[PDB]
Amino acid sequence: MTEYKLVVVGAVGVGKSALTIQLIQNHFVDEYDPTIEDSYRKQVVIDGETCLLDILDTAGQEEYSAMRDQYMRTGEGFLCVFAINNTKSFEDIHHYREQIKRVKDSEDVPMVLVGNKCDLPSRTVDTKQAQDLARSYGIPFIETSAKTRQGVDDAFYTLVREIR
Amino acid sequence: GRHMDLGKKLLEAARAGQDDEVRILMANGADVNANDSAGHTPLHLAAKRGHLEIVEVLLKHGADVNAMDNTGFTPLHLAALRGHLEIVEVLLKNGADVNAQDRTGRTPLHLAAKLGHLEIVEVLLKNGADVNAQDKFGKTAF
Ligand SMILES: Nc1nc2c(ncn2[C@@H]2O[C@H](COP(=O)(O)OP(=O)(O)OP(O)(O)=S)[C@@H](O)[C@H]2O)c(=O)[nH]1
Ligand SMILES: [Mg+2]
Numbered sequence A: 001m002t003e004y005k006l007v008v009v010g011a012v013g014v015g016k017s018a019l020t021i022q023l024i025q026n027h028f029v030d031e032y033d034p035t036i037e038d039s040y041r042k043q044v045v046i047d048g049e050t051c052l053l054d055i056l057d058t059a060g061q062e063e064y065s066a067m068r069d070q071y072m073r074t075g076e077g078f079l080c081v082f083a084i085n086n087t088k089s090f091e092d093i094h095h096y097r098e099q100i101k102r103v104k105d106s107e108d109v110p111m112v113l114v115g116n117k118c119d120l121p122s123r124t125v126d127t128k129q130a131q132d133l134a135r136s137y138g139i140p141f142i143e144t145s146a147k148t149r150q151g152v153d154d155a156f157y158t159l160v161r162e163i164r
Numbered sequence B: 001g002r003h004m005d006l007g008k009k010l011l012e013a014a015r016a017g018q019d020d021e022v023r024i025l026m027a028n029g030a031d032v033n034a035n036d037s038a039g040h041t042p043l044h045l046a047a048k049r050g051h052l053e054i055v056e057v058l059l060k061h062g063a064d065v066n067a068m069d070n071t072g073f074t075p076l077h078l079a080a081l082r083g084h085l086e087i088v089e090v091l092l093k094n095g096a097d098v099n100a101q102d103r104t105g106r107t108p109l110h111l112a113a114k115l116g117h118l119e120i121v122e123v124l125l126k127n128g129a130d131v132n133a134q135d136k137f138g139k140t141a142f
Helices: A016-025 A062-074 A087-104 A127-137 A152-163 B002-015 B019-027 B042-049 B052-060 B075-081 B085-093 B108-114 B118-126
Strands: A002-010 A037-046 A049-058 A077-083 A111-116 A141-143
Touching (some): A002 A062, A002 A087, A016 A077, A016 A152, A037 A152, A049 A062, A062 A087, A077 A152, A087 A111, A087 A127, A111 A127, A141 A152, B002 B042, B002 B052, B019 B052, B042 B052, B042 B075, B052 B085, B075 B108
Parallel strands (some): A077 A111, A111 A141
Antiparallel strands (some): A037 A049
């Protein structure tokens, strides 16, 4: 089958790990364990085709920012996650995007913008603002909740389609 | 049934650093090399977290000192990444492969040098780490 190398990036505490464990194990982890760098493997069916997702879940913590180069070289697609009650994390998508482009020497890298934690009542980052950001970058925008599982498959599967 | 479930609790106890809960789970037959979905063993989680006692205990109980998770990290990669010196030492005295490569070709030295852990770099070189080792992009530790 075709293997897709997916990389999940974003700021501390946005739900990168909770999204990923939802995809792999279908369960929601309420507990913060800070990620260094973890790999997960899932054989799935997308658009009627069997394929393998090789998923790297990365560190939000800036102390590991020197490891970014390496996973930016190896990844085929990037799930760019922010949390909808975390302005800084939305703004940080810019820094992630810029580094990706510089490492791949390209403006067209498969990428999906993920607005996580859409189950939450109040929010500080507008849906419109995110839709605009994704239209600027020419990439899809998906609203997710790792807690409810909303949009979880959609987000990863959409990144796969972008790699194709 | 039970045996699998002891593994998951051993993983948790090793991560959460409960030194004595580890001792019990082992004596109820738990698997010392139980894997989480990311491929970590208890020794990876204990090395990552910096729990020296738990690292010693797991090694006394036949833990695979060069086990690799799904990213290709050994426990020595994890201890080095975050500067846990005495852990790096103990792992090495128990036969850790000093030049083990992750899936991208990085040794422990690559990671220690990348994150500026100078005391780990020195101890790694004293234990036969290769200064000219290249990862899969041709890049040395520096
Ligand atoms: N309400 C809600 N909480 C969430 C959601 N996703 C994650 N969380 C919670 O946020 C906290 C941090 O999530 P986590 O997945 O660990 O962040 P991270 O992005 O991996 O952080 P890091 O490893 O780079 S340091 C956890 O308590 C988790 O339960 C969500 O969709 N909704
Ligand atoms: Mg995480």
